[PDB]
A paper describes a structure:
CRISPR–Cas adaptive immune systems capture DNA fragments from invading mobile genetic elements and integrate them into the host genome to provide a template for RNA-guided immunity. Here we reconstitute CRISPR sequence capture, processing and integration by a naturally occurring Megasphaera NM10-related Cas2 and DEDDh fusion protein (Cas2/DEDDh) in complex with Cas1 (Cas1–Cas2/DEDDh). The natural Cas1–Cas2/exonuclease fusion (trimmer-integrase) catalyses coordinated DNA capture, trimming and integration. The Megasphaera Cas1–Cas2 retains the canonical heterohexameric architecture, with two Cas1 dimers (denoted Cas1 and Cas1′, a or b subunit) bridged by a central Cas2 dimer.
Isolation and refinement of particle clusters representing maxima of the reaction coordinate gave linear and bent reconstructions at resolutions of 4.1 Å and 3.9 Å, respectively. The bent structure features a pronounced kink in the centre of the repeat region. Disruption of a single A–T base pair and DNA unwinding appear to accommodate the strain induced by this pitch, although this assignment was made with low confidence owing to the low local resolution at the bending site. Bending in the centre of the CRISPR repeat symmetrizes the integration complex and draws the repeat/spacer junction towards the Cas1a′ active site. Although PAM nucleotides are still present, probably due to their cleavage-blocking phosphorothioate modifications, the overhang nucleotides typically sequestered during ruler-guided trimming are absent, suggesting that 3′ trimming occurs in an intermediate step between the linear and bent states. Only the first three nucleotides under the C-terminal loop of Cas1b′ could be assigned, and the C-terminal cap density was largely unstructured. These observations, combined with the proximity of the second integration target site in the bent structure, suggest that engagement of the CRISPR DNA by the C-terminal loop induces uncapping of previously sequestered PAM nucleotides, followed by DEDDh-mediated or host-exonuclease-mediated trimming of the exposed 3′ end to the ruler-defined length. Conformational analysis of half-integration structures suggests that, once anchored into the CRISPR array, DNA bending engages the C-terminal region of Cas1, which in turn exposes the PAM for removal, enabling full integration. Binding and bending of leader-distal repeat DNA may lead to disengagement of the C-terminal cap, which covers and protects nucleotides.
Residue numbers in the entry:
A (entry chain F): 2 to 282
B (entry chain E): 20 to 129, 134 to 311
C (entry chain C): 2 to 279
D (entry chain B): 20 to 311
E (entry chain D), F (entry chain A): 1 to 93
Amino acid sequence: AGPIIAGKSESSELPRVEDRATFIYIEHAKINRVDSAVTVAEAKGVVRIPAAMIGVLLLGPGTDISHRAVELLGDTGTALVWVGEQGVRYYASGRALARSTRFLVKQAELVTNERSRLRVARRMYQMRFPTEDVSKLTMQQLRSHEGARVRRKYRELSKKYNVPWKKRVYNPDDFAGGDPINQALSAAHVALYGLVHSVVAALGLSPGLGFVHTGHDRSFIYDVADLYKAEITVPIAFAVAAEAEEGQDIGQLARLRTRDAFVDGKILKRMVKDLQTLLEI
Amino acid sequence: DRATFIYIEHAKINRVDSAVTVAEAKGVVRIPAAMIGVLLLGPGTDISHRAVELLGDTGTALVWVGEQGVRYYASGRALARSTRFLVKQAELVTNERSRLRVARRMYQMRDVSKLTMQQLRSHEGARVRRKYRELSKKYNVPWKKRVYNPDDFAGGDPINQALSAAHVALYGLVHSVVAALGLSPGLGFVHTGHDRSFIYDVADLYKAEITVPIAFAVAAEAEEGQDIGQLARLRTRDAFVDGKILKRMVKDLQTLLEIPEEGQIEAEPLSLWDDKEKLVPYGVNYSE
Amino acid sequence: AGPIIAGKSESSELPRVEDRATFIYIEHAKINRVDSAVTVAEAKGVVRIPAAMIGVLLLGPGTDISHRAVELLGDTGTALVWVGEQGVRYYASGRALARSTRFLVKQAELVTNERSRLRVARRMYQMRFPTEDVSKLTMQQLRSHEGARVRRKYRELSKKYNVPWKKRVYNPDDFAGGDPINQALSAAHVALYGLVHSVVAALGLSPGLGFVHTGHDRSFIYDVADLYKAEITVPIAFAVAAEAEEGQDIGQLARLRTRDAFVDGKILKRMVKDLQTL
Amino acid sequence: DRATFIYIEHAKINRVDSAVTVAEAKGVVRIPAAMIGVLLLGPGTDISHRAVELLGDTGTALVWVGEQGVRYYASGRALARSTRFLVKQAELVTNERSRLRVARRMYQMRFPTEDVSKLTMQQLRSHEGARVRRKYRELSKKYNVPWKKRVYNPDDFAGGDPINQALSAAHVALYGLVHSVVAALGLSPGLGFVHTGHDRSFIYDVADLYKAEITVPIAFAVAAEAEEGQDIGQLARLRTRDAFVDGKILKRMVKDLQTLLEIPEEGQIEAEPLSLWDDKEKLVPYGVNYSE
Amino acid sequence: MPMTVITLKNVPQSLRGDLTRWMQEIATGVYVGNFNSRIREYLWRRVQETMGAGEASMCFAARNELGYDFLTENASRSVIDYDGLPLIFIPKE
Amino acid sequence: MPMTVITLKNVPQSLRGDLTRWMQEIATGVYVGNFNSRIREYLWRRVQETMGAGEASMCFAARNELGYDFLTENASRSVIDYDGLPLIFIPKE
DNA sequence: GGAATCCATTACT
DNA sequence: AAACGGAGACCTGGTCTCAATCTGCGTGTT
DNA sequence: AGATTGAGACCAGGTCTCCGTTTCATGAGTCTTTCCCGCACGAGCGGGGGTGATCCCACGCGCA
DNA sequence: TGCGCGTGGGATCACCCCCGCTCGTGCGGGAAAGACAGTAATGGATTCC
């Protein structure tokens, strides 16, 4: 091919969305690009994140990121998500990773048709709950029926793992993260939230096209993430809350447990394999 | 209906209580974030996570670009957490009846009511062919023909390199603009099959008016012995400094999407070190 | 464990016998030990041999090997064979890699008993030709069977590849020949001869306790090599000579293809199982 | 039926026309290959391929040993490529009746004056433990070295009694040559009679015929003549290797191995431990050339 | 996925950081990662032209006994085969 | 079948030639080879005890999505676990 | 017969 | 406000060469 | 003689700083179809490896 | 000092762990032609120098 220069590479030279790691949490560091390399710099020293195999590069509190750093990360295709306490805060992404918009245009056909929207919206449920029939359940009931089911799973947890539950379904907009239980689930939740945004920009899908959540440009993310919302991360993170000790940071070990759940559950393989089925390709 | 497009380069942004704090070499700027929608973050800028904390609350969109959009690098959320613009784009692209209407509207922006998609496409090639012929004699330059190697830019004609360098600047600007507005570059009307399909469709509006004369101008004064992609980039940089192009483009997208005039949003540039007198009455503290 | 010293290691540190490479072919160079490293100093430079992953090493004409190098190689379990022209010249082995002698003591019991030697020879032959039934057959007419079949295998393969013959059967003793087929047979064969010598010493099995052959201290390796030479080394030995052109190093081409034959045939894993059942 | 256990160290060897040459610092010599029975290759020696091919056809046993055979490193084929001793060993070890015979035979050299040919293995090993206590005690009082009990640790060589460290080093020093002759004669080191289950099992049984006569007297002597803070492992090897210089002990193993294997006296070969500069006058009349 | 390792010396500092996006830097001029066949070829292709005047050698899983093979260009140590076996050759200075 | 690379700096020359019996030398102080779990663990003990005062690090395949993990002893380039990932850390003076 | 011109003659965007 | 290329400049750390040294790494009835 | 150690010279590569120069590596007037390249899952799925148990003298020693 | 075994101690016969699972498929990726409604350059039909 043509000349290859530092920081620039074709999508062929870069690993596919499946062969990459999940995420990295960052806190109190400056992200600067030196010698054409992303370098997260802390007080003690510098660490070179291997961007090529990063799903999403989570960004925490008290951190600074330069301009060429975002450009270098965008070229790699790793998503950038700003998170702190009380829930997720901001999203970012590069241009793309796949040059074919076939996935996007197929999604465009599906969203516009009301008949097509109802077909796919019901099909969320049997991927969430394969033992129930939603063949004759309307769009309005979908919001209410799934709204009760997500609450039921949490209620089952409270009596199961023997730890108090605040009865607060995760709403990322100005969420209540006071009690250590809440940050554990939220930090677990933002891990997939960054992951879901990471793959969607990689495959060319647009987060604006909503299925069950509507009104915001992150509607598609809030729906795909809802597919695996309670199946994988919720039992693992809540079980972490049961195995809680004092004198250590809950977030770091909880994030580690979500990592093991993600690799054990093959979330990256399952999620895109679904989207291929979800688009009838 | 008020949209603020602010370009920041060679500076640093932090937060104190509720406003972003630009720390450029001239001084400290205290723009409130309650009325900010776009941060055209230029080269060599530093953003603080605390600053990003507020911008999410107001629906402000972040875009990372080069010299005021000469190239597009990355973006974020949309204006005021609004996805209606993209929704109409999806509606306008599925059925070919809507697709043909906007495609015909795109051509007349550059008779259209009877030309079909292939019929429209041939004319655009004809008109663009005449435009190259006209400027070649107008600028008295020896343009043989548009011959280009996509994977070999160094080996090529200076005029061909000039157009290639000039064009790629334009797509970056529109991509930065369209990403902020909340649309999707994949959903193209005439162009289709690429992640920037919508980009090359919209950018065709201003290729003849802006970039092509710039590419021919730099080629006319081009001297053998130096690169011209840098020269073409700067000749686009100053042309993009004014920001009247962005004002035209945001209106064109609303017209292209048949946005009602009442619902149409007007966007204007804000140069912090050049529009000080305008920003002071809105509650901005300036320091040196 | 105790202290660790450079140049010395336990059996556990060394890899398993069948998990290593087969052989290397070294000529016109001096083998020395510098900085606790087996090194081959050729005319233009030096190379370092990963002795842990090496089964048997070979030495051709015009080479020199130092006393310290021998013991360093012997510690790793890699045996030494002086691969001169006209076939094998001499052997060399170090301490047995295997700590126990349960394999060795069982071999002694089987080899010394005439009926057990008969039974083992029955097992040895049927691996070569499983189709035939050798329930009632003794030592004297065995040697007729293998010798004829090897000749028959040699003849039919020669015509299949159209190579001239001198009607000779290959033995590593008192061999000779200027025709390219002569050294092509030797070079391919000797790698098998070296490989079996290394592994048999690694397992702790003495080479003098042969069954088909008897009369020398390397009888056992000859008998084991007889089991696999017809199956493996002979087809390539004829194949490489026919494929080779004039003015070319037949041995380099010959040894290269035999290494592939050792890989795909799973010879190392197979024979250790074969020695297990013998 | 004479085998030459000639020792080579600090020299280069090659081939000129038909006889092996030696390139030691003192001079260059041209010993014929026919005379060579066994080359005890010591430290600081290199071997040329042309020498080996001239040595392979004549059946010479090339053994790589330590300084004067203090240690064993590696070896090639047996002398004259024969294996009659090894096959004899296998026959005499497979059956208990010969195992009874040879096991009592070894104790006969252990107790030349006392007949224990009727004592079973349990009594033989029992009375074997009796003599070792006396020999340690008797030599302890002779050299005024305080002796308590055989105490050591294979995983901890440094943390040992100076008497024990010398004793352990002395046995390993003798283990060298006694394994070298076994490999030179082609015997299987694995097939041991008293000791069984280790690749050196045959070596320990043969070496025990000389441990009470060489190693223990040397080890006790070294322990007395040793100052604090000085490592004795090299001292024990150096003191032992002095006894190997003459080679008189070397003939003893050669004769003994035939005696243990019940080889007929005519078939009992006897080795001659030659040395280059020790027997210059002896080699020259046969046809050896000595050049400065 | 099979492992891969890259070595570098006397190379412009632009590349020394660029490859760190793919493979981390355990030591000076040493990079390690787990890549398939397609990805590794393109990265080696990247180092093919931007190495400048220096050394670059790479190792990866192969289909021989040792299970790895070497590729070198403009290298102090050439790679020589002994009957199909990759062994490092250090030329005499 | 797993792969393992070992890097060294400022170590006695006795050990530098020692792993040449297990590894090969693609570059100075850089050794690479293929082991199982048992052989690699045992050898890492050897380079741990004999290196004395020096630099020693190694890369080996692991059970994480990165596909490998890091073990370091007396290493300037330490390793920091970002919730289950091995990343090379370089202290700054 | 061939040049100049037109439309086929052939072919570029 | 970053961030990279070129020109030192200084350093450790690897490598070669020349005396001095040892022949080598230790279990086998307590 | 060969190999190791140590002391000492020696010098190339790495790294740091300082100064200067950039804000960059450069397509599509047009999409569609079709020949090369794919690598994870589907079908019945038993050859390996980690290791408890234990022998019989090694460490040590008690009565005799 | 006579006499053996109280703790081992790791290979090894063989026990239960593992995926068993590797070629074809078919699912996406290419890349190169190949269309699609237009001029430009140029040569035969027509007529004139």
